Amino acid sequence: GAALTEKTDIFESGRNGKPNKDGIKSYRIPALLKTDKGTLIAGADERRLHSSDWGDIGMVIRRSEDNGKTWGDRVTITNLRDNPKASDPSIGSPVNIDMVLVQDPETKRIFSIYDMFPEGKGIFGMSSQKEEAYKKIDGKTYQILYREGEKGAYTIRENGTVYTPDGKATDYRVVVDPVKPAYSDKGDLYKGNQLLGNIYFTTNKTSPFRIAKDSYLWMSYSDDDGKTWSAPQDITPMVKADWMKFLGVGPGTGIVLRNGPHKGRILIPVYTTNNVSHLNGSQSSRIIYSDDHGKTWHAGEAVNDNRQVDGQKIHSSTMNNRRAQNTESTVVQLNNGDVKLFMRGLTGDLQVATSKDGGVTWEKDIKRYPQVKDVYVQMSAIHTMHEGKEYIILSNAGGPKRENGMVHLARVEENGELTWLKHNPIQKGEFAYNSLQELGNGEYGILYEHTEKGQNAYTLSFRKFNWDFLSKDL
């Protein structure tokens, strides 16, 4: 008997453009993680001012200890404070946006990796010119601070003390070890004991310093099953190349390889843009990984690196080809050791890349599956076993637009090839980003974006379904 539970709203948006009960207009970008303890962690972007990809956005989660039946109160991981002097509040806050959750099965540490931008319009407000964000000194890497009127780079060193371009300590200090709830004090700039401003503010500044205007990657972790989180760690310098303009995560839930030469490796989907074509023709998927339980991260190569496009080779750092782009993605490892990267794209159908070396490089054959439509929106996919057989469950909008949620089932053969077996609707009406997780006992859960009755984009809801829903027809 087919079984699909009624939708349960986890993060409720307001309606008709009004704020919700907590004064928040929108929630977006779901992430669902089933931890070792059986806990379900639902993550999301808490977009207070509007539904756009910038503004005042906090990284939040809710925990369920009864497999999705009930949920605890919201837990904020990170939420930077707004620039109280910005002329336009809608774009007047440093930004955190798009999160990826994953747990190390050995250490049990839970990671939340997400984007960070200083005050502005996020990916839509990036400068045409690069600004160095870090400087190496005496074998040490320090984040840079810029002061109007001076060309030299100041640096943030031990204890947050600001040093002049010439290497002399100043009386300015940055809060590099935040202590306020949500770490809303991170980046605060002090002169002596007086708070002057914040290094993440870019307009109407009250302090002399700001970090480089660029795209960053931050990470927070929890060792207590999601109840409390560490202060944000800037992992950007570990993975961002000097040519990269944007570098952000493909939101959802990452994975840890289960088998092969790279078992234990944590994979985080991400994508970049270059300075040649940025968002018009350079969005390129890839993953970043960690082989030491999240201590250090490394960038793999882009699916587009040395890819053959129309008898011509391209590279993610120099490409300018709209149709060859691949953006947000979801990653899965097969029992044969191969890694599959399902990438959001502009071909109208499902695009999948394959890596034979734990996600570092990608094979030449980018497969397209007409069986699974892609309206250019995020998707999620997970590996699963059923009666000794290997499968992959993938969910995304069925179209025409971002609507009619579908859960696709594919059989995985020993060569890693896919055969799509079923396509079952799961949510009528508006449907966008989603995140799947296997719950066990033949059941699965999904946290997704949907709206109805005038709700603001989006309300994130949860549903559970079993194998009877996947295989049998409704």
Ligand X SMILES: CC(=O)N[C@H]1[C@H]([C@H](O)[C@H](O)CO)O[C@@](O)(C(=O)O)C[C@@H]1O
| Closer to ligand X by Cβ: residue 29 or 350 | 29
Give the residue with the Cβ less far from ligand X, 409 or 457.
457
Does 443 participate in catalysis according to the annotation? Answer: no
List residues near ligand X by CB under 6 A: 29, 53, 97-98, 115, 122-123, 248, 279, 283, 327-328
CB of 208: closest distance to ligand X in angstroms? 29
- For ligand X, the closer CB: 232 or 358: 232
Catalytic residue among 104, 328, 374, 449: 328
Distance of closest approach, residue 279 Cβ to ligand X, in angstroms: 5
Cβ proximity to ligand X: between 53 and 56 the closer is: 53
Scan for tokens 């795209």, then name that residue: 215
Q: How far is the CB of 232 from ligand X (least distance, A)?
A: 17
Catalytic residue among 46, 53, 56, 214: 53
> Would you say 68 or 269 has its CB closer to ligand X?
269
Residue closest to ligand X, measured at CB: 53
| Closer residue to ligand X in complex, CB, 211/334 | 211
**Residue at token pair 């953006």:** 327
Least distance between ligand X and beta carbon 309 (Å): 19
Q: What is the 3-state secondary structure (H, E, C) of the chain?
A: CCCECCCEEEECCCECCCCCCCCCCEEEEEEEEECCCCCEEEEEEEECCCCCCCCCEEEEEEEECCCCCCCCCCEEEECCCCCCCCCCHHHCCCEEEEEEEEECCCCCCEEEEEEEECCCCHHHHCCCCCCCCEEEECCEEEEEEECCCCCCCEEECHHHEEECCCCCEEEEEECCCCCCHHHCCCCEEEECCEEEEECCCCCCCCCCCECCCCCEEEEEEECCCCCCCCCCEECHHHHCCCCCCCEEECCEECEECCCCCCCCCEEEEEEECCCCCHHHHCCEEEEEEECCCCCCCEECCCCCCCEECCCCEECCCCCCCHHHCCCCEEEEECCCCCEEEEECCCCCEEEEEEECCCCCCCCCCCEEEEEEECCCCCCEEEEEEECCEEEEEEEEECCCCCEEEEEEEEEECCCCCEEEEEEEEEEEEECCCEEEEEEECCEEEEEEEECCCCECCCEEEEEEEEHHHHCCCC
Rounded least distance, CB 102 to ligand X, Å: 18
Spatial CA neighbour of 382 closest among 293, 431, 443: 443
449 is a catalytic site residue: no
28 belongs to an annotated ligand binding site: yes
What are 268's two structure tokens?
């985080």
322 is in an annotated binding site: no
Task: Name the residue nearer to ligand X (CB basis): 143 or 284.
Answer: 284
> Nearest approach, Cβ of 250 to ligand X (angstroms)?
9
Locate 15 and state its tokens.
């309606």
To ligand X, the closest distance from the beta carbon of 352 in angstroms equals 18
Active site residues: 53, 328
Binding site members for substrate: 28, 344
